[PDB]
């Protein structure tokens, strides 16, 4: 049982204090803006960072900073359950009940079904605006075990076209693909908001 830690949403001084506490525990810490297959993501708040969405898509633990504080004080990694984002839902919140429960929902759902990710068996073509990088979107999709179809790969079996300005594109242009078009927001909504 490994503890590969990443953090999202903390300012520098908060992150320094938390990483100092990791020296009391056997673990791996990965410093990167990118999702790097952490087993435990420590999140300052519910959010839509690459790390948060990717951790949801892979059914990882997404926990509060108290998980690190209390584990370090105990000298041992504790049970994650009561520290999970989703363990307790705030009925008066800017975040929907679905979004507040999303990390727990995906962790439990992937264990239930046996699937390795929220997007397993998806075969996705990305049509992202040419001025911006799709790289964070790709790493979230791949964290969920979607197959992102590169331009040099055959389009056989595409399931989703995810497109900048999907709602604007002409039917003639949508006709270049067998699969339906989805806006960029669909990815976040599928993980955080949609009732399955």
């Amino acid at each position: 049982p490994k503890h590969i830690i990443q953090m999202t949403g903390f300012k520098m001084e908060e992150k320094e204090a938390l990483v100092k506490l990791l020296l009391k525990l056997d673990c791996t810490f990965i410093k990167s803006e990118k999702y790097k297959n952490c087993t435990h993501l420590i999140a300052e708040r519910l959010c839509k960072s690459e790390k948060f969405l990717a951790a949801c898509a892979a059914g990882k633990w997404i926990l509060t900073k108290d998980y690190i504080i209390h584990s370090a004080k105990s000298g041992r990694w504790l049970d994650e359950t009561t520290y999970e984002w989703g363990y307790k839902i705030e009925k008066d919140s800017r975040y929907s009940p679905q979004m507040q429960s999303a990390p727990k929902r995906w962790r439990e759902e992937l264990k239930r079904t046996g699937a390795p990710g929220a997007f397993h068996r998806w075969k996705v073509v990305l049509l992202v605006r040419t001025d911006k990088r799709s790289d964070s979107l790709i790493r979230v999709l791949e964290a969920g075990k979607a197959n992102v179809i590169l331009p040099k790969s055959s389009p056989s079996g595409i399931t989703h076209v995810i497109a900048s300005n999907a709602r604007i594109k002409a039917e003639k242009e949508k006709d270049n693909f067998k699969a339906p078009f989805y806006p960029i927001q669909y990815l976040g909504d599928f993980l955080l908001e949609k009732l399955e």
């Binding site: 839509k48 900048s164 960029i184 927001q185």
Partner: peptide, 16 residues
Amino acid sequence: DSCNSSSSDIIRDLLE
């Protein structure tokens, strides 16, 4: 800090 500037909303970043 430049060494701590991950986006907190990658969907928003792609919309505008």
